[PDB]
Design an enzyme around this catalytic site. Structure first.
Site, short mmCIF file in Angstrom:
data_model
loop_
_atom_site.label_atom_id
_atom_site.label_comp_id
_atom_site.label_asym_id
_atom_site.label_seq_id
_atom_site.Cartn_x
_atom_site.Cartn_y
_atom_site.Cartn_z
N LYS A 185 0.65 -1.21 -0.09
CA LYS A 185 -0.23 -0.17 -0.07
C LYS A 185 0.85 1.24 -0.10
O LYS A 185 0.57 2.16 -0.82
N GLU B 90 -5.14 7.39 11.77
CA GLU B 90 -3.92 6.95 11.52
C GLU B 90 -3.34 6.64 12.67
O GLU B 90 -3.39 7.29 13.49
N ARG B 91 -2.61 5.56 12.65
CA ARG B 91 -1.90 5.13 13.70
C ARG B 91 -0.49 5.97 13.49
O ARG B 91 -0.04 5.63 12.53
#
Lengths: 187, 85, 50, 499, 468, 83, 119
Positions: free
Chosen positions: E156, E182-183
């Site tokens: 990705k 979002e991590r």
């Protein structure tokens, strides 16, 4: 804004009417005269016991106007409009409620304060005065604001004292101290 | 039903499919229980229906595999044949 | 070591119940009366510090 | 004795002062006291009742401020003075919690008195930024060969241990801690992982077993057990990993490393649900609150390998999620799986089939990869992954009279399968993980019959110590299997295998 | 100075009572200046009597009821410029890259409305791409939304990186990678990688601007990150004429974040525990993403399945807006194909003969049929036998396998990873290449010559190099 | 009790002074709590049912709920515009 | 409930005298044995056997608490344990009974459990 926000549930609309009594500022004296109307309600209570009785519609509002005709006019046109409003909202169970709340707002404008010194037992009158004095000699009563310190008797509130006024207390009771002593000697 | 099932001493479950299968009324005794049991059953009738239960219980399992149409082992088909009757 | 610790715990609970005995004794006495006056004056000194 | 000193200490507490804010309960029902007063109270502030019970003040509403009690309603009643602590929820933090079992509040339930706490830090404090993190480069060893090789674990990392209920779920986790006792002994303070077990809704008996096991393996002397027990209130249970995390931040920020094991967030979820429903806050999917996701993500973003400007240190975490019949489709599992990087999916059929550890590594993954794997161990375990994969696939070709080729795979697989067994509460040194895996990889255990596999392992190890414990030490210190080490090892393995 | 004292803090829904005269309009931005940080509250109601109900962007902890508030008077306004490129910016519009105060030029409110019917382009045009696979089987549409499929790290990051490089070449565009849900751990990697891959160069130039919206940040700030990014993009589109490409991360967390805020606001959540106002939030966002005459914001958005339930309202709502779907597969990446895109699941709504070109369509249909038959053929080619099945059947397998290998593009971002130099092959050149492969005038060219090549011209050469 | 213009202290305050709608607000309204795409208007007593009203904000709405003392319009228009 | 420090935990082994139970899931004194089962699968019967074997065998006391169980079952249990002599109306019993029935409102059904616990 009215001196002190009640939070104003129902009766708070009448507290805003007390703000309007400051606005048309003769309504401040109208709060004294409305206290006289509450005194008329204090003569009322045989009829006041009937007045907690529900279901007086337009005929209930007319019957309230008949009690008002027995009255001399304490609280004036704002009080008459409140009589109509309370009639329209149909409740005598928040009739005296508005009275008490208007009283709080009124005596807030006056600047009177209410304290209490709940204790296990009654306290000296010398003690009463000395604490009222102390409170004046503290920022709590900055002076410019009155105080009605009421000692209350509640032996359940164990030995020692708790002073209360504002959101400020000193609690030098026995129970709390005993609690702390115990805890640490179980540690 | 759940509340009632807990309260009651038995369930007498009926099955719709078995109604069509030709038992009319049809009682599906898989989910039917009587906890009170055979103290309320006639002694004679306790004796005769003693292994009626065993045969049926065997029949239920045996019948379930048996629908496939294969020529199963004879011991299982002893059950199958008896059970059908 | 294990018994030393156990003996310490036992001592602590002994003195705990003896503390309860002192609590029961104080609350009868007119030390119950006299210490209210003490709390009154203690609160006088405290509140004057405000 | 101690008592004479203690009474004197208490006597030395007698100062008292005017309380800035107070409340008086207006009504208390359903553990949702609605308190009248507390006008200038701080939000989520810690509040002390006359009963002394603690609460936080989730709802500040203009008319009433709805405190949530952290304790019992039994001792709470209407019109109760609620002193206003003026301190937002904070828990003691310091090196004192090392080898100490404390309840959630931070009180010792091992009764080892005052905690050496150099700060009390608020329970929730926001996660370290993009630049305050740097990439993982530090392995962590569980002492379980499969886990260390098949699912390589590092420090900073967050990975689930998601599997069936009490299948020694805690046991799998506890094994890591025990292997970490070895590393902890080590003077390198990045290898001093100050482990934290967060017992969430776990009965005091269950934690008692854990405590004794920890004492037995002498692991109490870096352990922290934040304890929110089964009986303990659902608000305490809710804040329990958050509270715990702040302790972890102290180590992490100090540049140290540590491992926090949240066990089990599934019951943590239930407690938040209980709370939310009691606050009449709406249910959401799978009758869990919708901001459960938000909650979990906050917790898990405190496990991080910090940038070196922000200190090397890290917090590593391994949340444990209890599966309701392996349903990872469940809302709380799905959410966590996305947030975390890796999952370990313990396979219950294997557990039932007596394989302890019970894991299917078809359903375990780690996305923190071989920057969390020892270089030596990487070399000799690319093969291992592939062989076991084949053993699995070619399993069904045995369930038929079929080719010699399949049968070769099956033997090689079976010996490997047997090898990764290990009776729980036996950890292993990496320098002894590598030889065993080397032998298996080279299929030198194929000859060794299954019953003699168990015997072989320990014997091979003792043989390695007698013949050349220099080799073991050399493997350890190089951290990479040199051509010379593989040379010596190939000879050595053969000789041992021969006998 | 519009000021009010806080009169509730029930959750993160803070009612502020403002001194009677000041009537806040809905969607205003309030700032409560706090000692530790600042707090941005967004007015989401008028509760009447100079009171509001607001949502929070930042945590409301330790707030005291009666704290003075300052009302900015409208939505948060974020700086825009090419200055803001290559800066990690939080929702507020302030540096979190820690490279100091971002050079502001103009700032613009984060809320904006979709361009009018007149401003919408009546004809849909196709955005050229440098990835051949993209350019055949799901050619990007200018303005359109392309919804990414596949799991995390199936390639990705590398896919996204390639695109940033390509957009700059293709048009001259810019991008803004906005990461929702979002991590922050994953975010660090992305930032370091992006710096490395030179799509960001802190010393050099940066095409991409980053906006990261972590999962630890409140749901309200999760909801508003997307709007903020879009405002920045629109400055490029409208006011720099640029065709730009705005990436979004998970739209699952767009829904989740929106859901929480609605329920807190008391708006009854609709089915499957999702916001009632679900549709409109996508509507504004995905009609602000459009081709104006000036420019076009094209958006590649990332769709993370909620529980594999595409039947869920939220995926469906997303899919309605989308013009293309790119369906990555790790199985495909395992056949060594970079791009990793699964060709049989690579589909776009624009693929029509008129829209993509008659030739392009005809070539596409044939290439789809060829592969489709190859897959099916490969099933029974394996079972029955290669030579135990027709010469024609293995011919299709061979022709297909030459196409399959031809898909493999060792492109520039992943030049490091493949080793082999970057291959940027334009859409026109892609059509040309497939025509020759279709006419099989290069079925005398090895499959491992079509492996890891650019255009048709290029794989003439690779065949030569294998021989030479 | 329930939301009524007697609960609404400012509406109430005008009444308790004496002044009221005085038919002006039997055909015009004034907006109160607006947001969540509904507005609550005071007055409009001559409103026809499902009438079109125009807010002075260039927004028009269709009257939906004719309630004692209040009308709850539904906005053919955006919240930001109305106040 | 007793605190963490009040816990003293080790497991002794109960012997039920039922072979399957003993071998394949031995019971432990101090334990939390759990008889998951369907409706009347001799659920009562299993308990009755346990009382019959273990209660007489051990010297300890027991408290048998029935939370929401039937008055038919109740009359049988009383009689049955009078018969097994585990309850003797003159002379001691190594068990106590707290018979709670389902007709009693749910509130009482809740705190019959707490009642038994206190004994």
């Amino acid at each position: 804004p009215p001196p002190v926000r009640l939070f104003g549930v129902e009766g708070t609309y009448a507290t805003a009417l007390y703000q309007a009594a400051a606005k048309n500022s003769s309504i401040d004296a109208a709060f004294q005269s409305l206290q006289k109307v509450e005194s008329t309600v204090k003569k009322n209570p045989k009829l006041g016991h009937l007045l907690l009785n529900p279901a007086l519609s337009l005929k209930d509002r007319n019957s309230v106007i008949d009690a008002i005709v027995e009255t001399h006019k304490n609280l004036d046109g704002y009080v008459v409009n409140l009589l109509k409003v309370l009639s329209e909202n149909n409740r005598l169970g928040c009739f005296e409620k508005i009275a008490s709340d208007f009283g709080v707002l009124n005596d807030a404008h006056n600047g009177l304060l209410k304290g209490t010194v709940t204790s296990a037992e009654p306290l000296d009158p010398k003690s009463f005065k000395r604490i009222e004095k102390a409170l004046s000699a503290s920022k709590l009563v900055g002076q410019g604001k009155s105080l009605k310190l009421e000692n209350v008797v509640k032996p359940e509130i164990k030995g020692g004292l708790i002073v209360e006024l504002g959101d400020k207390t000193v609690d030098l009771s026995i129970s709390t101290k005993i609690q702390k002593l115990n805890k640490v000697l179980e540690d | 039903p759940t509340n009632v099932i807990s309260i009651t001493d038995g369930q007498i479950f009926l099955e719709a499919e078995l109604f069509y299968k030709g038992i009319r009324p049809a009682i599906n005794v898989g989910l039917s229980v009587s906890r009170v049991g055979s103290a309320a059953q006639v002694k004679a009738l306790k004796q005769v229906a003693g292994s009626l239960k065993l045969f049926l219980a065997q029949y239920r399992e045996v019948a379930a595999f048996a629908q496939f149409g294969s020529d199963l082992d004879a011991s299982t088909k002893q059950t199958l044949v008896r059970g059908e009757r | 070591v294990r018994y030393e610790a156990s003996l310490r715990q036992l001592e602590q609970r002994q003195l705990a119940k003896s503390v309860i005995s002192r609590v029961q004794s104080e609350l009868g006495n007119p030390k119950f009366q006299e210490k209210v006056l003490q709390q009154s004056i203690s609160e006088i000194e405290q509140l004057l510090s405000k | 004795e101690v008592s004479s000193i203690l009474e004197e200490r208490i006597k030395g507490v007698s100062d008292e002062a005017n309380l800035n804010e107070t409340g008086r309960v207006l009504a208390v029902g359903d553990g949702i006291a609605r308190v009248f007063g507390l006008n200038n109270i701080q939000a989520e502030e810690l509040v002390e009742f006359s009963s002394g019970v603690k609460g936080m003040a989730l709802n500040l509403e203009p008319g009433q401020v709805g405190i949530v009690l952290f304790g019992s309603d039994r001792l709470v009643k209407e019109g109760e003075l609620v002193k206003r602590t003026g301190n937002i929820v904070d828990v003691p933090v310091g090196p004192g919690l090392l080898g100490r079992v404390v309840d959630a509040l931070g009180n010792p339930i091992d009764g080892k008195g005052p905690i050496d706490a150099a700060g009390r830090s608020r329970a929730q404090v926001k996660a370290p930024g993009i630049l305050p993190r740097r990439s993982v480069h530090e392995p962590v060893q569980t002492g379980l060969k499969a886990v260390d090789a098949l699912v390589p674990i590092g420090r900073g990392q967050r990975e689930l241990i998601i599997g069936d209920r009490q299948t020694g779920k805690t046991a799998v986790a506890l094994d890591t801690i025990l292997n970490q006792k070895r590393w902890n002994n080590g003077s390198d303070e990045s290898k001093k992982l100050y482990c934290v077990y967060v017992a969430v809704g776990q009965k005091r008996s269950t934690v008692a077993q854990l405590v004794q096991t920890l004492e037995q393996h002498d692991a109490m002397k870096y352990s922290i057990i934040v304890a929110a027990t089964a009986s303990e209130a659902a608000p305490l249970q809710y804040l329990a990993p958050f509270t715990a995390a702040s302790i972890g931040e102290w180590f992490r920020d100090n540049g140290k490393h540590a491992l926090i094991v949240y066990d089990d967030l599934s019951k943590q979820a239930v407690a938040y649900r209980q709370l939310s429903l009691l606050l009449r806050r709406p249910p959401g999917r799978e009758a869990y609150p919708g901001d459960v996701f938000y909650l979990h993500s906050r917790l898990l973003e405190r496990a991080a390998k910090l940038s070196e400007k922000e200190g090397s240190g890290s917090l590593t975490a391994l949340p444990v999620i209890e599966t309701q019949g392996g349903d990872v489709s469940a809302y709380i599992p799905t959410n966590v799986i996305s947030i975390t990087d890796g999952q370990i999916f313990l396979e219950a059929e294997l557990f039932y089939k007596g394989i302890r550890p019970a894991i299917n590594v078809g359903l375990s993954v780690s996305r923190v990869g071989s920057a969390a794997q020892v270089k030596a161990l990487k070399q000799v375990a690319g093969s291992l992954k592939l062989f076991l994969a084949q053993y699995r696939e070619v399993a069904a070709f045995a369930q038929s009279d079929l080719d010699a080729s399949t049968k070769q795979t099956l033997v090689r697989g079976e010996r490997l399968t047997q090898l990764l067994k290990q009776n729980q509460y036996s950890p292993l040194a990496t320098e002894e993980q590598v030889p065993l895996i080397y032998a298996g990889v080279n299929g030198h255990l194929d000859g060794i019959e299954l019953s003699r596999i168990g015997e072989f392992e320990s014997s091979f190890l003792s043989y390695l110590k007698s013949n050349h414990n220099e080799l073991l030490t050399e493997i350890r210190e190089k951290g990479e299997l040199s051509k010379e080490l593989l040379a010596s090892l190939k000879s050595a393995t053969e000789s041992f295998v021969a006998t | 100075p519009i000021t009010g004292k806080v009169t509730a803090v029930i959750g993160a829904i803070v009612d502020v009572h403002f001194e009677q005269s000041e009537l806040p309009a809905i969607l205003n931005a309030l700032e409560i200046k706090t000692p530790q940080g600042k707090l941005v509250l967004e007015v989401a109601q008028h509760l009447g009597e100079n009171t509001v109900r607001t949502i929070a962007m930042d945590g409301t902890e330790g707030l005291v009821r009666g704290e003075k508030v300052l009302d900015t008077g409208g939505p948060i306004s974020v700086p825009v410029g090419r200055e803001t490129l290559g800066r990690i910016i939080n929702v507020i519009g302030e540096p979190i890259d820690e490279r100091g105060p971002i050079k502001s030029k103009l700032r613009k409110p984060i809320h904006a409305d979709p361009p009018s019917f007149a401003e919408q382009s009546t004809s849909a045009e196709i955005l050229e791409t440098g990835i051949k696979v993209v350019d055949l089987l799901a050619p990007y549409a200018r303005g359109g939304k392309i919804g990414l499929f596949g799991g995390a790290g199936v390639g990705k990051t590398v896919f996204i990186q390639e695109l940033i490089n390509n957009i700059a070449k293709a048009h001259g565009g810019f991008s803004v990678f906005t990461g929702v849900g979002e991590r922050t751990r994953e975010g660090n990697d992305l930032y370091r990688e992006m710096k490395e891959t030179g799509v960001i160069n802190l010393e050099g130039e940066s095409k991409v601007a980053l906006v990261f919206g972590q999962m630890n940040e409140p749901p309200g700030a999760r909801a508003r990150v997307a709007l903020t990014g879009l405002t920045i993009a629109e400055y490029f589109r409208d006011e720099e004429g640029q065709d730009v490409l705005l990436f979004i991360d998970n739209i699952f967390r767009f829904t989740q974040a929106g859901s929480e805020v609605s329920a807190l606001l008391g708006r009854i959540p609709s089915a499957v525990g999702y916001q009632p106002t679900l549709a409109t939030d996508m509507g504004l966002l995905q009609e602000r993403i459009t081709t104006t005459k000036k420019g076009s914001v094209t958006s590649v958005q990332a769709v993370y399945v909620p529980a594999d339930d595409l039947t869920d309202p939220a995926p469906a709502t997303t899919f309605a807006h989308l013009d293309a779907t790119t369906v990555l597969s790790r199985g495909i990446s395992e056949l060594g194909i970079y791009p990793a895109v699964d060709p049989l699941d690579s589909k776009s709504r624009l693929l029509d003969a008129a829209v993509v070109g008659q030739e392009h369509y005809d070539v596409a249909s044939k290439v789809q049929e060829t592969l489709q038959t190859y897959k099916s053929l490969q099933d029974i080619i394996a079972i029955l036998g290669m030579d135990e099945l027709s010469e024609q059947d293995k011919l299709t397998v061979e022709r297909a396998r030459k196409i399959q290998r031809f898909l493999s593009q060792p492109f520039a971002v992943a030049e490091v990873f493949t080793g082999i130099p970057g291959k940027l092959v334009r859409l026109k050149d892609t059509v040309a290449s497939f025509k020759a492969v279709l006419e099989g005038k290069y079925d005398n060219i090895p499959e491992h010559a079509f492996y890891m090549v650019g255009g048709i011209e290029d794989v003439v050469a690779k065949a030569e190099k294998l021989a030479a | 009790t329930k939301a009524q213009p007697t609960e609404v202290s400012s509406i109430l305050e005008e009444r308790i002074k004496g002044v009221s709608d005085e038919a002006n607000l039997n055909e015009t309204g004034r907006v109160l709590a607006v947001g969540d795409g509904i507005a609550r208007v005071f007055g409009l007593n001559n409103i026809q049912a499902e009438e079109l009203v125009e807010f002075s904000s260039g927004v028009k709405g269709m009257a939906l709920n004719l309630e004692p003392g209040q009308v709850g319009i539904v906005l053919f228009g955006s919240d930001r515009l109305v106040k």
